[PDB]
Structure formats: C-alpha cells, structure tokens
C-alpha cells in the first residue's frame, strides 16, 4: 500500500551527459522525473537587454534574441539568486540579477567576429559556457560601425521561455524489447535491435508478459553546458520536492478552512 523502494544506478558519467537506470519505480513518476528536467530546472540566462547604440546589419531585436539564448555557467549561484519578479528592490539588485556589458568598435579592415568571449560579466561565477573550443557567434561587423549594450541576466526556468532550458536532450525509454507489449510490431523482423536489448539473433522479440508493469527505465540526459548533469538531476528532484511541499501546505490550509 506504500510507494515501492525506488532503486537506481548510473552506467557512466561525463561532462557532456549522464546515463542511468531506474529500477522499481512507476511509469508516471519516471515520466514526471523526465518532465522536470525539461521544464522545472531553473538557470541563469540574459533577460533584459538595453542597447545604447547598434549599427550592425542585424537589427537590434535580433541581437536581443541571440543574446537571450547564450548559455551561462550557473553551477550553484542559481540557488543564491532569487527571482526578479519576486525580489523586492529597485529594478535589479546584485542579489536578484547579474550584469553584462558588451562594447565593440570594429576599426580594422577585416570583418570582426563579435563573439561571446567579448561579453564582460560582473560575477566570476557566471560566464558564457564557452569561456569556462571555438566561440559562440553573435554578429559579424564590418569596419566602421559599432555595438554597445548592457544586459541583465536573471533566474527563470523552462516554462517561461526555452532559453532557460538547460537539458539539451533527454532520451527516456523502457522495455527495450516490448516485453510489456505496449507497442505492436506487424513485422517485428524489420525493426532494429534496441541497443539495450538482450535478445538473440534469431528471436529479436521478447515473449509476451501476462503479468508485469514497466520497470528498469532508461535515462540519458545530455547537458547543454550550463550545468553539470548531476547537478541538473539533483536540482530537478529538489525543485519537485519543493513543489510537492507547496501543494501539501496549501491543501492543508484548504482542509482546515473546510472543516
């Protein structure tokens, strides 16, 4: 009658991504664990761009767009920062934001590549992922014109905009051999063996399971460079716990009002 004992284990880890397996857990909880990675993993990304003077061939709004999508290293300072719309202060304060500056004046004959390395930050903890490999391109500049802007970056999360989404790609699956027979193959010969399959060469089709439920879910989360994958997963779980706690508190108050 109680939630089963979830059991997990990692296959291998790397800066690029993390691959792991979950055992003794339900499909719905696994799916929610996935969804939280895509949606509810807050990070720091540029969100307020003020342009003193723009003269390149990319119109200003395009530059604001591109600066929006650059990734920033937010290993732990994300916890310290507190949402902008929620922080009570004058406009932006060092607690609820971070400041970036970008001034470039191409004066040489050759075209200059205005690139992310030129974005001067205020706090060393956060910088474009490329800094700390080729640079992320912003806009090319001909001799003569200039680009001067000041940006403020804040803490958001997936729902608000996809520039806050750090999970480059999540591969979620289970029953690599359709044992549960959720899916049906009219010609199971044609389909390719899943890399996680354990079937023989001839069979290539697990037997039907009269009694069973999805188990041993497989996860492969690839970071976009904003956060280490392990930190991503931990933050996902912690934020989901926070949400559940909020729901419990509100509904307890509702029950007390009811009675």
């Amino acid at each position: 009658p109680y939630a089963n004992q979830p059991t997990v284990r990692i296959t291998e880890l790397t800066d690029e991504n993390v691959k792991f397996i979950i055992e003794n857990t339900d499909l719905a909880v696994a799916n929610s664990i996935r969804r939280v990675f895509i949606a509810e993993v807050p990070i720091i990304a540029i969100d307020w761009v003020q342009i003193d003077a723009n003269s390149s061939v990319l119109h200003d709004e395009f530059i604001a767009h591109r600066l929006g999508l650059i990734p920033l290293t937010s290993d732990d300072i994300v916890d310290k920062l507190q949402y902008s719309r929620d922080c009570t202060c004058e406009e932006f304060c060092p607690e609820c934001s971070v400041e970036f500056t970008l001034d470039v004046r191409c004066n040489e004959d050759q075209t200059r590549h205005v690139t992310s390395r030129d974005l001067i930050s205020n706090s060393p903890r956060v910088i474009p992922v490329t800094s700390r490999q080729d640079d992320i391109l912003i806009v090319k500049l001909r001799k003569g014109q200039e680009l001067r802007l000041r940006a403020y970056a804040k803490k958001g999360f997936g729902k608000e905009h996809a520039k806050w989404n750090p999970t480059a790609g999540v591969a979620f699956e289970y029953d690599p051999d359709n044992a549960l027979r959720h899916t049906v193959y009219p010609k199971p010969e044609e389909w390719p063996k899943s890399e996680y399959s354990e079937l023989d060469e001839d069979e290539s089709q697990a037997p039907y399971d009269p009694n069973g439920k999805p188990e041993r879910f497989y996860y492969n989360v690839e970071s976009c460079g904003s956060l280490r994958p392990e930190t991503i997963v931990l933050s996902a779980l912690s934020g989901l716990k926070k949400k559940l706690s909020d729901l419990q508190t509100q509904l307890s108050h509702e029950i007390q009002s009811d009675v």
Binding site: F92, C93, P94, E99
Partner: protein, 96 residues
Amino acid sequence: ALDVDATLEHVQDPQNTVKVQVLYPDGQAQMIHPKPADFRNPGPGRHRLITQVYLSHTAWTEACQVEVRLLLAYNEGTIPFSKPVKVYIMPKPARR
C-alpha cells in the same frame, strides 16, 4: 553607527578614562574615545554613557561578530572592566 549605552558605577573621572574598544573579526582592535558630553550623571557616582560607535569594512560573504567592550585607561596601558558583547555585521558590496 552602533548605539552604545552603558552604566558606569563608582568611577572617578569617567570622561577622561573610559574608552570603547571595538574588536573586528580579523584581529584588528580600534579604540574610540567618547566625547566629554556623552556622560550623563543621573545620580551619585552612577554615570550613564550614551554614544555612537562607527563600524565599517569591505564586503563580507556572511554575517560576522564585532565585539564591543569598555576599557579603562591609566597614566600607558588599558584594563578591560566589562563583559564583551557581540554584534552581527554584514557589509554587502555596492549595487547599481
């Protein structure tokens, strides 16, 4: 500015002797002479000291403890004669 309020009992020449000492966390001790006007005299040999002590320092990551104590000088050297108290201080760095 930290308001400092104290009661001094049975002291001769309080105004020329008593001095407020502030020990910062980092091991530096600053001596502060209160003004001759800071010493009220409600009753016989029982003075009150009211003053401001000015604290300052660069930015700290977290709150710290600044110790405030009352010293007695002589004519050369000093004697603590009071219980040190702790005050929480937090200098944040400049804003925009």
